[PDB]
Ligand binder design. Structure first.
Ligand SMILES: *[C@@H]1O[C@H](CO)[C@@H](O[C@@H]2O[C@H](CO)[C@@H](O[C@@H]3O[C@H](CO)[C@@H](O)[C@H](O[C@H]4O[C@H](CO)[C@@H](O)[C@H](O)[C@@H]4O)[C@@H]3O)[C@H](O)[C@H]2NC(C)=O)[C@H](O)[C@H]1NC(C)=O
Ligand SMILES: *[C@@H]1O[C@H](CO)[C@@H](O[C@@H]2O[C@H](CO)[C@@H](O[C@@H]3O[C@H](CO)[C@@H](O)[C@H](O[C@H]4O[C@H](CO)[C@@H](O)[C@H](O)[C@@H]4O)[C@@H]3O)[C@H](O)[C@H]2NC(C)=O)[C@H](O)[C@H]1NC(C)=O
Ligand SMILES: *[C@@H]1O[C@H](CO)[C@@H](O[C@@H]2O[C@H](CO)[C@@H](O[C@@H]3O[C@H](CO)[C@@H](O)[C@H](O)[C@@H]3O)[C@H](O)[C@H]2NC(C)=O)[C@H](O)[C@H]1NC(C)=O
Ligand SMILES: *[C@@H]1O[C@H](CO)[C@@H](O[C@@H]2O[C@H](CO)[C@@H](O[C@@H]3O[C@H](CO)[C@@H](O)[C@H](O)[C@@H]3O)[C@H](O)[C@H]2NC(C)=O)[C@H](O)[C@H]1NC(C)=O
Ligand SMILES: *[C@@H]1O[C@H](CO[C@@H]2O[C@@H](C)[C@@H](O)[C@@H](O)[C@@H]2O)[C@@H](O[C@@H]2O[C@H](CO)[C@@H](O)[C@H](O)[C@H]2NC(C)=O)[C@H](O)[C@H]1NC(C)=O
Ligand SMILES: *[C@@H]1O[C@H](CO[C@@H]2O[C@@H](C)[C@@H](O)[C@@H](O)[C@@H]2O)[C@@H](O[C@@H]2O[C@H](CO)[C@@H](O)[C@H](O)[C@H]2NC(C)=O)[C@H](O)[C@H]1NC(C)=O
Ligand SMILES: C#CC[C@H](NC(=O)N[C@@H](CCCCNC(=O)c1ccc(I)cc1)C(=O)O)C(=O)O
Ligand SMILES: C#CC[C@H](NC(=O)N[C@@H](CCCCNC(=O)c1ccc(I)cc1)C(=O)O)C(=O)O
Ligand SMILES: *[C@@H]1O[C@H](CO)[C@@H](O[C@@H]2O[C@H](CO)[C@@H](O)[C@H](O)[C@H]2NC(C)=O)[C@H](O)[C@H]1NC(C)=O
Ligand SMILES: *[C@@H]1O[C@H](CO)[C@@H](O[C@@H]2O[C@H](CO)[C@@H](O)[C@H](O)[C@H]2NC(C)=O)[C@H](O)[C@H]1NC(C)=O
Ligand SMILES: *[C@@H]1O[C@H](CO[C@@H]2O[C@@H](C)[C@@H](O)[C@@H](O)[C@@H]2O)[C@@H](O)[C@H](O)[C@H]1NC(C)=O
Ligand SMILES: *[C@@H]1O[C@H](CO[C@@H]2O[C@@H](C)[C@@H](O)[C@@H](O)[C@@H]2O)[C@@H](O)[C@H](O)[C@H]1NC(C)=O
Ligand SMILES: *[C@@H]1O[C@H](CO)[C@@H](O)[C@H](O)[C@H]1NC(C)=O
Ligand SMILES: *[C@@H]1O[C@H](CO)[C@@H](O)[C@H](O)[C@H]1NC(C)=O
Ligand SMILES: *[C@@H]1O[C@H](CO)[C@@H](O)[C@H](O)[C@H]1NC(C)=O
Ligand SMILES: *[C@@H]1O[C@H](CO)[C@@H](O)[C@H](O)[C@H]1NC(C)=O
Ligand SMILES: [Ca+2]
Ligand SMILES: [Ca+2]
Ligand SMILES: [Cl-]
Ligand SMILES: [Cl-]
Ligand SMILES: [Zn+2]
Ligand SMILES: [Zn+2]
Ligand SMILES: [Zn+2]
Ligand SMILES: [Zn+2]
Lengths: 694, 694
């Protein structure tokens, strides 16, 4: 038989291990020769594995790199202009590498150049609420200051945007051991913690779903018209640089001005965490000086695109994609995911060589330049948007397969909740103590739904990975799954060695997954999802699950508004239309499900499969959200305060945010009412796509 | 048999005549009770005729009406403030009506209120080139003046926008007998010419495809959020009023200042056609004063939507739509079209009662408020955009069936050229001298293609009727056909009695089509198109015809650019990408046609029907054209100088227009290059939708 069990049984932990080792021996930074060579290797291998076609799709996009002969660093400088302390020029390389070349030193990609010098202000995680605390409550003015902020809690580009709007002239980002050093485990190479010399790389775009900053809307092909840098999309306006906690200690230890407002502002270093501005009495005349000389440069990137043609519905596409570019060795991010994709392709190819084909076409993608802001996936989706929006069934992402070894983590559209529940009930748990139990059982026990007994948590999609263009711009049902830790307050901060030189094969093999059993479980979940999406006669989407969450999201946004009862009275702010639309969606979805259960007629089947496929698409507003033309989904968008998190009813949520501070309450509440009308209309219009067609 | 010949044979001239009489006895102005009563009648009749469902879809949209107790008029006023001449308060009603009530007096819908008084400037047709002639060559400044312009050549809203940008404080529009009085025919009621007291009504929106000015993007339903008037879309900022040629003579006869620059500025009245400003010596102290008191008001409108469910592909929609609202009696516009739609519905219903159903679903629409800027069709398409863009095969418009009795006129997407040619070869010509000949033969003889021997002229779609939202916003293949005159310089001016009280049943029955044979021919063309679109196994679209025109349009836009060879050198302006894309489209379309001719497999059939259906959709850019978010088609848009005309490669055409006058040539040519890249990309992306799908 060629069924799902045959596909899953062909997946082997030992192959994933061999692939991970193969992918992590040298750096594969986007736009470098090494990354192009790996692209060519994967292309050759996917062909050998049995795919019908495997092509490279290249684009010329804005990337950012340090200047090799003019290194970035930060100084404490004295009254005379003597630099009395300098931050490190590189991370101490891990054992046995120390002679690898082309390790990019830590830098914040897309930082502009500059040498600002000023007094420090410490801003905690530099979240919206941290700046509210500083400016509104503590009356500390960040204008003309260099801010220092710890990594964690929110996407670093949000920190940078927040600091810019506060008037900062530069940002220093650092990893505090509170966030990146788990108590009782050793620093790399003797455990999985971050050492004091480790540094987290990463782009600091003000992400708006655009892709390449120079070509919003259109693929960065050979004849593309490019914006000038000043008009580029998403680029920060102040210099930024990341540092490790040994260096941060030296910058923070002299800080004066005000005490931290409370304990949530204190990390684990032996410093006061004073907010500043500037240093205590004796050192009041010293300043901090940044030296940033990175350059933005248009550079060629390469996606590998493999096709396994469908036997029955070749014009329906199920996509499994994940990126290949890494900051350095990519031991977890992304190669633990890419190794899983490679073994999935190998398994589907084995079935194909035996004469099987999936019902629908499967596309496999190895994306480039994800680390520089999702550039490869976004340019390819821009190029192929017409094909994808009329033919795209689903997108399953495959970045890092593991960020811990505790339990499963899943973010997906409500249309895939039932599929995920059903698939995990048929997979074996890899967890100690759950031998012979299902993955659904272990997952549900370890990560309970906050709403439902006996169900697991599944979160909302935002940005931060390559599914963004497919889901938030194009409205293709999307999902992601990986193995994760037990560390809730840290779910957006990254594992300790995230984007550091210490993310190696040895890190994974020694400390995360020596048997590759968690990798294998993740391959079964991602591959099983793709198998079911590509082979089920009726698409495995349950519209009733969307109706359940829409009511949840409507109750939640109403509750936010109801913090302002006098204004809702004054401006006649009613959510009645939105609750009506959700009620109608619930009723229509129930009737559609009955018909779906109740119909030999392939036209009715496909007509109903098209209704299922286009249901996610119906939540797209072609006008986009306010000032966010590429975030078009009306139910979900990346949070405006944290691009990693998804926000529900984002147009209403942003209209309501901090509304009590707006100077023209009439105008502000008018815009809330406008967003309620757009949301109610969109939910009703999506419901109507499930009605009888004529 | 139930085939096309059965459908066509059931159509009867005598029924169209009876329906036209029934629809034109009383005014059916949008938003009035009489128009709602007619909507209910049509709904009842379409049900009786055999449609599966017939519903009213209502919206509350901004309309405009004169004030019944404060009439609009224009005066010549003397030094003292005595109004020594007043224009007419109403058109003399036609014989036998003179006691009809609720005839709306002539007015320009959406004019703001005001009583500006000033000196006149005469601006010919108030086209872009007429204002270029005035300001640039004649050095006449229109600022603070009242302009007087003759109707004709371009949409009146373009005249008004042009006058506003010239600084005019008001506009008077009039019908010159040069344009509205054919030599040798009598004025109504003794012939089809405009009398001196006749006046052309019409909206003066600055049309941008938005629909209701208060709700751009979203349907004007019960909970809709409305823009304030100041932010409304498309509204003119200066008062405007139309008048007949008896009144115009009185305003023009005293005009002084400069002589007309040449004979193309002179109409047929016995006046000098001096351009002004102001009156000759003796009357220099007299002024012109407007009195406009019309009011914009949100008013309910009603579309009738009838459904004939498809037997095989009920989720594919072929739409026949035309409007029902009229300015007064609507003898030609729209009821000559609506009578044709009524008989088409009756004929399809006859087949249905005998057990037949079309392969695909046919939707029939009687739209409201077309005369106020396409409001009913546009709000309904906004409401149902998700259904239409995933299911819409084609839209056939059905406004006025006749504007003359000479030959056929057709505007449609290249995808329907072959269908139109083939259908007209099987229809009988109704023309004297062509008894026993095909309609294709008479049409081709009377209206030859400028490009091809033995082929007829088919023009491009712009705006000005209810197909606009379907084609220019949503990218649904669209067409229109009617009988027309032999009067080429007048093809955008309207027949003489256009939008006047004299457009009656008697006008049509006595002077245009006593036998209703031209109406019957038009019913055969429109109905035959709908029949073939709804019943052909393979959709009757030929992608190769798009490839032919794309090359034509590329040669034409290149030729415009090549008027500026030094700039193309300086700014490296290359059309190479666009010609490459067109060449690729040609090659791919040829290969797709071969496959289409070469495949019992309904999945391949429907897969290929979906490729045909989505090909028009592929020319849509979700970002819209510059500052025109609702004109999304990259190959066609309504001309920015004449909304009635279509423009090809409109983004490049507008970037190039008057470019030699732009102050920053670098920026201007950069935007030309940007538009070439968008067009080349869109053509290539559309071509790729015709490639093998996997
Ligand atoms: C959820 O689906 C329900 C259908 O089950 C749908 O109900 C619709 O609600 C609208 C708006 O409430 C109804 O609109 C009414 O239509 C009638 C004619 O059918 C009109 O006469 C009404 O207008 C009068 O009353 C208004 C309200 O007081 C006045 O403002 C107005 O000036 C008139 O006096 C009104 O337009 C519509 O009939 C139903 N459709 C049904 C029951 O089939 C509801 O809209 C859906 N929810 C959403 C968010 O779409
Ligand atoms: C019409 O369809 C044709 C295919 O039949 C398609 O041709 C494609 O053209 C592009 C752009 O001209 C080619 O791009 C090249 O790709 C190779 C690798 O395959 C690259 O090495 C090339 O880059 C080098 O050369 C450039 C030009 O001098 C330099 O700017 C660059 O820095 C490099 O040195 C270049 O990217 C592509 O290979 C073909 N594809 C084929 C032949 O299959 C054409 O693009 C289509 N027209 C449109 C408007 O889409
Ligand atoms: C996840 O698994 C559940 C449990 O198997 C699936 O739900 C089950 O789906 C089947 C097939 O539609 C349902 O069977 C139908 O039952 C009705 C009788 O009510 C009958 O008319 C049909 O002929 C058919 O036998 C079954 O009721 C249903 N069970 C439950 C509890 O809902 C679910 O579809 C799977 N989700 C996926 C594939 O996305
Ligand atoms: C308009 O009418 C023309 C003339 O009938 C139609 O073109 C004709 O279409 C038929 C059916 O596709 C073609 O027949 C095919 O011929 C090839 C041999 O070359 C064969 O492989 C197929 O089995 C089939 O018989 C025919 O060649 C073609 N004639 C011409 C001159 O093109 C055209 O399709 C009609 N347009 C519509 C319906 O939109
Ligand atoms: C901190 O570094 C500065 C600058 O050093 C230069 O750039 C670094 C990235 C590194 O590559 C060095 O080798 C470079 O010389 C030091 O200040 C410089 O000191 C030298 C020698 O005394 C002097 O000639 C330069 O002008 C100085 N450059 C300045 C002030 O910009 C500084 O000594 C270092 N401080 C410490 C405590 O190590
Ligand atoms: C031109 O008309 C004006 C205004 O007349 C009024 O409004 C018209 C629409 C119409 O409905 C008339 O019946 C209205 O009286 C005339 O000027 C008015 O004349 C009357 C009587 O002499 C005087 O009391 C008003 O104040 C005038 N109103 C003005 C100047 O605004 C004027 O006489 C008419 N001119 C001609 C040549 O007929
Ligand atoms: C944008 C971008 C590029 C680059 N993207 C990432 O590094 N993404 C990483 C971010 C890890 C830290 C935050 N974690 C999450 O956002 C997350 C992780 C897993 C799941 I299932 C759901 C959400 C990832 O998605 O694994 C960056 O953030 O610098
Ligand atoms: C917009 C709007 C409302 C209203 N629309 C119309 O009156 N449309 C009329 C305009 C008749 C005068 C110009 N004629 C054309 O644009 C035309 C007519 C037929 C064909 I086939 C192709 C183009 C119509 O399309 O028949 C108006 O123009 O005032
Ligand atoms: C990763 O695995 C690939 C595939 O086996 C290795 O690339 C092959 O190397 C051998 C020996 O040099 C060559 O004969 C083949 O042509 C290569 N095959 C390809 C590129 O498809 C590669 O050497 C391995 N990399 C590491 C670091 O182990
Ligand atoms: C237009 O035709 C319609 C349909 O025949 C006429 O409306 C009918 O009028 C009769 C007599 O008053 C009534 O019994 C019916 O109820 C009406 N039917 C409908 C509305 O479906 C209408 O009278 C005609 N109008 C004119 C001006 O002749
Ligand atoms: C990168 O840096 C190169 C070397 O810069 C020189 O050496 C450093 C240590 C400084 O002293 C600096 O002032 C010197 O100019 C540059 O020559 C080169 O332009 C830069 N590369 C870029 C901008 O891409
Ligand atoms: C419409 O006009 C009504 C009557 O206006 C009055 O009579 C005319 C002849 C003028 O003399 C005018 O100045 C008078 O006020 C108004 O009462 C009514 O407001 C208007 N209707 C509207 C604006 O919808
Ligand atoms: C903060 O700092 C700068 C001082 O240069 C000033 O321009 C700005 O207005 C200040 N804002 C507040 C709120 O104090
Ligand atoms: C793997 O799981 C064990 C047992 O719970 C834990 O002690 C170990 O640190 C985990 N590894 C990682 C990287 O979390
Ligand atoms: C036209 O007229 C007004 C006079 O009030 C003036 O402001 C405007 O600048 C003039 N423009 C030209 C080009 O003469
Ligand atoms: C109808 O055709 C005849 C003969 O060519 C012509 O004289 C007559 O005026 C036409 N009617 C109209 C309205 O064009
Ligand atoms: Ca781009
Ligand atoms: Ca609207
Ligand atoms: Cl992932
Ligand atoms: Cl028409
Ligand atoms: Zn990653
Ligand atoms: Zn990463
Ligand atoms: Zn009309
Ligand atoms: Zn009209």
């Amino acid at each position: 038989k060629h069924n799902m069990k045959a596909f899953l049984d062909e997946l082997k932990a030992e192959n994933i291990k061999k692939f991970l080792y193969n992918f992590t021996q040298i750096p594969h930074l986007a736009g470098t020769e090494q990354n192009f060579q790996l692209a060519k290797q994967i292309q050759s291998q996917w062909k050998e594995f049995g795919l019908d076609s495997v092509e490279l799709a290249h684009y010329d996009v804005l990337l950012s790199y340090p200047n090799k002969t003019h290194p970035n660093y930060i100084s404490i400088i004295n009254e005379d202009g003597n630099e009395i302390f300098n931050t490190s020029l590189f991370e101490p390389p891990p054992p046995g590498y120390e002679n690898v070349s082309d390790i990019v030193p830590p830098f914040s990609a897309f930082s502009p150049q500059g040498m600002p010098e000023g007094d420090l202000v410490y801003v905690n995680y530099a979240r919206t609420e941290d700046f509210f605390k500083l400016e509104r409550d503590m009356k500390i003015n960040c204008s003309g200051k260099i801010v220092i902020a710890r990594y964690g809690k929110v996407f670093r580009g949000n920190k940078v945007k927040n600091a810019q709007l506060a008037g900062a002239k530069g940002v220093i980002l650092y990893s505090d051991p509170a966030d990146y050093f788990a108590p009782g485990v050793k620093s790399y190479p003797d455990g999985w913690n971050l050492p004091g010399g480790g540094v987290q790389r990463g782009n600091i775009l003000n992400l708006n779903g655009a892709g390449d900053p120079l070509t919003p809307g259109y693929p960065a092909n050979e004849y593309a018209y490019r914006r000038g840098i000043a008009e580029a999309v998403g680029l920060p306006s102040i210099p930024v640089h990341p540092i490790g906690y040994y260096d941060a200690q030296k910058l923070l230890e002299k800080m004066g001005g005000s005490a931290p407002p409370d304990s949530s502002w204190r990390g684990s270093l032996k410093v006061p965490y004073n907010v500043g501005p500037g240093f205590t009495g004796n050192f009041s005349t010293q300043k901090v000086k940044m030296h940033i000389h990175s350059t933005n440069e248009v550079t060629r990137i390469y996606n590998v695109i493999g096709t396994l043609r469908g036997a029955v519905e070749p014009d329906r596409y199920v996509i499994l994609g994940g990126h290949r570019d890494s900051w350095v060795f990519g031991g977890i991010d992304p190669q633990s995911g890419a190794a899983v994709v490679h073994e999935i392709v190998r398994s589907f190819g084995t079935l194909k060589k035996e004469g099987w084909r999936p019902r629908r076409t499967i596309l496999f993608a190895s994306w480039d330049a994800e680390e520089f802001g999702l550039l490869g996936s976004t340019e390819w989706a821009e190029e192929n948007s017409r094909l994808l929006q009329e033919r795209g069934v689903a997108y399953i992402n495959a970045d890092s397969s593991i960020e811990g070894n505790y339990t499963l983590r899943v973010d997906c559209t409500p249309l895939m909740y039932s599929l995920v529940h059903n698939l995990t009930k048929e997979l074996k748990s890899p967890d100690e103590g759950f031998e012979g139990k299902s993955l659904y059982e272990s997952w549900t026990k370890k990560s309970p739904s906050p709403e439902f007994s006996g169900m697991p948590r599944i979160s909302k999609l935002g940005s931060g990975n390559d599914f963004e263009v497919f889901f938030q711009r194009l409205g293709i049902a999307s999902g992601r799954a990986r193995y994760t830790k037990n560390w809730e307050t840290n779910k957006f901060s990254g594992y300790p060695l995230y984007h550091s030189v210490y993310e190696t094969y040895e890190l994974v093999e020694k400390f995360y997954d020596p048997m590759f059993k968690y990798h294998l479980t993740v391959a079964q979940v991602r591959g099983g999802m793709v198998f079911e999406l590509a082979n089920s006669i009726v698409l495995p989407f349950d519209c009733r699950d969307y109706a359940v969450v829409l009511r949840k999201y409507a109750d939640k946004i109403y509750s936010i508004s109801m913090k302002h009862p006098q204004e809702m009275k004054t401006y006649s702010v009613s959510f009645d239309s939105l609750f009506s639309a959700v009620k109608n969606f619930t009723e229509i979805a129930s009737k559609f499900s009955e018909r779906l259960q109740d119909f030999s007629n392939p036209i009715v089947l496909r007509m109903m499969n098209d209704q299922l496929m286009f249901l996610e698409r119906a939540f797209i507003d072609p006008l986009g959200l306010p000032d966010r033309p590429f975030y078009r989904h009306v139910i979900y968008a990346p949070s405006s305060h944290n691009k990693y998190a998804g926000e529900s009813f984002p147009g209403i949520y942003d209209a309501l945010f901090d509304i009590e501070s707006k100077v023209d309450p009439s105008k502000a509440w008018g815009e809330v009412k406008r967003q309620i009308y757009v949301a109610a209309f969109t939910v009703q219009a999506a419901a109507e796509t499930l009605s009888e067609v004529a």
